[PDB]
Write a protein that binds this ligand. Structure first.
Ligand code: HEM
Ligand code: HEM
Ligand code: NA
Ligand code: NA
Lengths: 713, 713
């Protein structure tokens, strides 16, 4: 059937804002996963997982009699889709079980691994999510094989439909770089927000870049992709050498033997894919990647044999039985065990990308250190494996169960514990009044609070107003935050804070993080008063102030809002139209289309625009909370045309006289163009809508202020 | 950005079951449109509409100084998308303002008409929906021009995103028949459920079939499409001649002057499209369809001139200024007024499809009768205009406001008013015990109540258990309803009914419609007891029994469930795969995917399959309400394969021994294959899920039993 996306392939897609409704969810409206998990007998689940590791099923026999290697790869790919640029991907939503991830070529035969876990999922039911179980299973694999993990946190709630993620523009799985939809340009520059080198890969091509088996060039792709997944050189070496201490690759015959990926397979396959016509299609005859490498002499036991082999041999370029490039140790004896035949042994083998850890000069120094000091290797790999598997879970307040590590890690963007009584309702009203008496304007108050709170993204649950990080590097210097204006507001608020805290008894105090939010609430209340409405904007205290020392400045960089349509801001010129970037930002903020619409219309008239731009400020009563943006936008007495200077800025002229009435951007005018957004704008632009507009604006402002308040979950 | 639909273009689309969530809706969850409408000053709206008619805007000037013709066309197209096959389309959801319909070529310049309405929509706000406004405006246009309408009902709630409708498979707007995606095969057979001859047309091509100007061949298409919109010959003739008593077509210059449709236009167009480079682009120079025809000597007044012209002249084939085929009266004087220039007059003109009303022999006889008896024409057009505009609104209980006609019409599928005391909870428990003591089985009671209730479709709000139409022709004879078994159950129920009604005092009685549903409920209670659960199924009395004379056998035919996955039934072999047909049926029933899943798993184990087919009956305790369907479907100890005799039936064998354990259809197996459905099946197939399954099954059973209960809304 032909669809709207076929007819108008470039129209903005709002359905990404309306995913994950209560319609698609099989659990009750009241189901609370954290409460279910808190009662799980986690020890009992782990003893079942342990037994599973060595209980081979004949429909996918276990290599070496042990599924450990398979399940470590399963959990590394569940986590390995993560991109720091947008926080999308990772293990936190269990998305490996849905399209497209369930059918990426890099995920071949992980369908088998997931199916092996159905009995345990079925036994424990809603008390352990698929998302948590994937990770836990990786942990238990490592434990069963003699590696002590750094810990585990539960709390990844299952999702029930595919996440909307940009994975690239290519129309061919694994397409080499340089095609009509190339993800590369310039001197091998990978486009943001991507974090893999080819469509359907986790990070890099195990043969080398675009198939070229040069370990030195492969190392450049590894470092770039890993950095785009928030991992540095030490973490990278530790993860790769750590993972490849276990198990094996599968390449026993030609890849043309392998049939359809799970989403294309016939109904009778019952959710599995990659059925192979090569000999038995499984076990000794398995074909997954097409490579056929077994790294260590004890693939089902933790050891330091990966680096002993890497450094102890010289390596020769060869081909697997499927024809893929790989490497074999020159002059070696047959010391590596066969996965099914106790009478056969094989020479050590390596991937091109393993050899990167020796042949890249910076990696070589880390790898030698780890080889010489295996205790350092084990500790780095444990900490890296934790980071890998938890990096998208958000603040530590979301971490559940008896195995959470006590050590606070910088990448967690830690927030200190609150150790004093909180302000009460009467205190909050006094603070709002003192903020308003200081001479701070509605515009300043709203803009500051918006800047602090709207760094949150629901993709990895980073950012938000908790921590008062807006006063720290780098946030205080971001152009979107208007650094000089910000410094003057913060100074005035910190004086209000000092005075209030100096007057208290009993240890009560207010954090700057809470006062920034509260002040923004006072602004919104005043703006409502300016329009004739008496409202109380809700406020929940309990945020704490983080220090510069607890703030990783480099990792914070990815939260910089280079496009923020809610402030009519675009840092530079991008290939993606500004309206698409607005809907992307709404998605990260967890906003529906109605919420996006209300919030944008309000922020325009409150004076939230960066630079005090007049674009979209369609009101003669700025700093009053009215529906004027929608009324004026929708007025057919105004005609709009792009300016000669800039086709992305529009002038709105009286249709009869020609007199200039307004100017707007694409972000402003999309609400009068897109047929679904225009239908929302019409609701708020109606004559009966001012009370509804105030209420819905206060609700969505409070939602935004609370996005990171997992302490109140 | 490449999406799952790009990778796997034939995968089943579940997002149709989760459209219209509370996420996309700008109204609060408690908003009740009928309550808002009931308070509207309808009189005031109509006065404003009357004023609008002659208040010409310079950006789309009114032909003849009166917009009535434009708004009549606007209302007729709002209604004219309706298909009796599935009940989808029509005016009832206001979908003309959304994609794709807002941009269909047949809707060209109706974006102007809708924008002319924005000031009235704005003024009255949520109290009148766009959906109602579009039809009311049509009505007012008719009244302003001298035509007395039969009535008007409000209550069409606005919707907030595009409806999921199959409009055809063609990839080119207006493609002529016989292309790679042809909607025609055989001897001009249009594929169901379509009701238009080309992609982007309302019904037929005004030049003639595929552009060939033959009025007698055009009449065949007119009769087929209009029948597929629930209109017969008399209604058809009355609507076409009635509509074309007013206004004009627009074809002043070549169509190459006209630019992009609304969904393709630049953001500065602010929701409008078809901007024209021909002269002033509007008014006297307007180009809409390309035809240039004005039918009557008084285009802004009701008259009998359509038929006087049609019969009074002989017609000659000519071309408009855009090159389109149309007809001109031989030897006539210049009697038809110009829309803008008082000094020009034109000869009478007609479309090919107008001439069909004279040159088709059955239409000719109706047209002559209307010509000779103008009162009869007036009454039939008033009735047909009401039907056109209300055919998708459902039962009379949904009709709101002071203009609703008192006359009950057959196409409304009328149900008599209840005129007696209803049964109470004590009576319901007595009746259920009598039903269970009769010897009727769980399978019989469930299957009958399912058959009665599952005729409902939310697309046009036809069908459901109200009316006890399952005892009448044609429902009693449908193969899916098992006529012999149905008759034996109805006989036993009607004996129970007679005995209970004979024992009452006052006028209390129970209808058969209620008893059918109540007996189904007793069967579900019994099945739950059979599984060891104590469950009371909710029941709401108040359904009444319709007569055969209130039940139009021909219009009931479209509700026949030729595919019903919930009974594992398929009447014949179809081009659409059975799982697609199940999701389509779930959509019509208003079910989400979790509801569809629970419902289907319960019906399988309760013995609801047509013919007592064993396909999908994955239980050894049939007639007990358990989650067996899910537990056995998801068991990896079974391997499935299509049978040699029939690739659409699958055998499930023990993986170790080869022994046959079950058989299933595509409808059964999709729940173990599609990755999102399998995730839902897993929830209900878990060890902790038996109580949840029972309770979610009762809820969705009750939902279905109440789909048509607008007497209780
Ligand atoms: C440059 C980065 C990496 C590359 C290119 C890569 C490549 C691969 C490939 C091609 C396979 C074989 C798939 C098959 O045929 O079965 C594989 C296996 C595996 N990888 Fe990696 N890998 C990388 C990093 C990782 C990391 C970070 C981990 C975990 C810490 C990991 C753990 C494993 C394990 C355990 C297996 C063995 C699976 C089994 O026994 O079935 N690898 N790797
Ligand atoms: C075979 C069925 C019909 C065909 C092929 C058809 C075709 C058309 C076409 C091609 C136009 C010109 C559009 C333009 O260029 O502006 C039009 C105009 C119109 N039609 Fe129809 N029509 C049909 C039935 C209907 C019915 C059932 C009604 C209403 C009861 C109706 C009422 C109108 C009116 C009022 C106009 C004039 C619009 C104006 O003044 O701007 N027609 N028709
Ligand atoms: Na994420
Ligand atoms: Na409909």
């Amino acid at each position: 059937g032909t669809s709207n996306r076929d007819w108008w392939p470039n129209q903005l897609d709002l359905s990404i804002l309306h995913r994950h409704s209560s319609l698609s969810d099989p659990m009750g409206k009241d189901f609370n996963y954290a409460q279910a998990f808190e009662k799980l007998d986690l020890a009992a689940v782990k003893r079942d997982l342990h037994a599973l590791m060595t209980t081979s099923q004949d429909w996918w026999p276990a290599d070496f009699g042990h599924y450990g290697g398979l399940f470590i790869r399963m959990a590394w790919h569940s986590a390995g889709t993560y991109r720091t640029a947008d926080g999308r991907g990772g293990a936190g939503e269990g998305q490996q079980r849905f399209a497209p991830l369930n059918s990426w070529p890099d995920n071949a035969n992980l369908d088998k691994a997931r199916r092996l876990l159905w009995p345990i999922k079925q036994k424990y039911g809603r008390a352990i999510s698929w998302a948590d179980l994937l990770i836990l299973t990786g942990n238990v694999a490592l434990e069963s094989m003699g590696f002590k993990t750094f810990g585990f946190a539960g709390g990844r709630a299952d999702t029930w439909e595919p996440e909307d993620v940009y994975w690239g523009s290519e129309k061919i799985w694994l397409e080499l770089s340089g095609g009509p939809n190339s993800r590369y340009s310039g001197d091998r520059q990978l486009e943001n927000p991507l974090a893999a080198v080819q469509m359907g890969l986790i990070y890099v091509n195990p043969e080398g870049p675009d198939g070229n088996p040069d370990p030195v060039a492969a190392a450049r792709d590894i470092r770039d992709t890993f950095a785009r997944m928030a991992m540095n050189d030490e973490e990278t070496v530790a993860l790769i050498a750590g993972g490849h201490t276990f198990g094996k690759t599968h390449g026993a015959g030609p890849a043309s033997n392998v049939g359809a990926e799970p989403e294309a397979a016939g109904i009778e396959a019952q959710g599995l894919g990659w059925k192979s016509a090569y000999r038995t299609g499984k076990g000794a005859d398995a074909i997954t990647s097409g490579l056929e490498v077994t790294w260590t002499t004890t693939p089902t036991q933790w050891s330091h044999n990966f680096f002993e082999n890497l450094f102890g041999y010289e390596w020769e370029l060869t081909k697997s039985p499927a024809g893929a490039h790989q490497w074999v140790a020159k002059g070696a004896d047959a010391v590596i065990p066969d996965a099914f035949d106790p009478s056969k042994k094989h020479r050590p083998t390596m991937l091109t990308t393993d050899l990167s850890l020796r042949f890249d000069p910076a990696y070589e120094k880390i790898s030698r250190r780890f080889h010489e000091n295996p205790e350092q290797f084990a500790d780095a790999f444990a900490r890296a494996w934790f980071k890998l598997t938890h990096r998208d879970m958000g603040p530590r307040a979301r971490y559940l169960g008896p195995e959470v590590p006590a050590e606070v890690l910088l990448w967690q963007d830690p927030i200190p514990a609150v150790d004093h009584p909180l302000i009460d309702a009467a205190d909050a009203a006094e603070l709002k009044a003192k903020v308003l008496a200081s001479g701070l304007t509605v515009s300043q108050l709203v803009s500051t609070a918006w800047a602090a709170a709207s760094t949150f993204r629901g993709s990895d649950k980073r950012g938000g107003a908790n921590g008062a990080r807006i006063r720290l590097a780098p946030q205080k210097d971001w152009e979107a935050n208007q650094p000089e204006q910000l410094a003057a507001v913060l100074e005035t608020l910190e004086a209000i804070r000092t005075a209030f805290n100096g007057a208290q008894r009993g240890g009560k105090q207010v954090s700057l993080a809470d006062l920034i939010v509260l002040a923004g609430c006072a602004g919104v209340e005043q703006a409502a008063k300016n329009a004739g409405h008496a409202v109380t904007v809700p406020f929940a205290p309990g945020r704490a102030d983080a220090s510069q020392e607890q703030t990783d400045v480099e990792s914070m960089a990815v939260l910089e809002p280079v496009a923020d349509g809610f402030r009519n801001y675009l840092k530079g010129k991008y290939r993606v139209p500004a309206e698409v970037l607005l809907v992307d930002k709404a998605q990260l903020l967890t906003l529906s289309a109605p919420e996006m619409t209300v919030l944008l219309g309000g922020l325009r008239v409150l004076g939230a625009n960066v630079g005090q731009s007049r674009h979209g400020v369609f009101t003669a009563r700025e700093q009053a909370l009215t529906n004027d943006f929608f009324v004026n936008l929708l007025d057919m007495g105004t005609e709009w045309k792009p300016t000669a200077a800039d086709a992305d800025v529009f002038e709105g002229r009286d249709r009869a006289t020609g007199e200039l009435k307004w100017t707007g951007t694409r972000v402003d005018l999309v609400f009068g163009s897109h047929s679904q957004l225009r239908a929302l704008a019409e609701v708020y632009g109606s004559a009966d809508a001012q009370e509804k507009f105030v209420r819905d604006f206060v609700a969505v402002w409070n939602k935004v202020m609370n996005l990171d308040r997992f302490d109140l979950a």
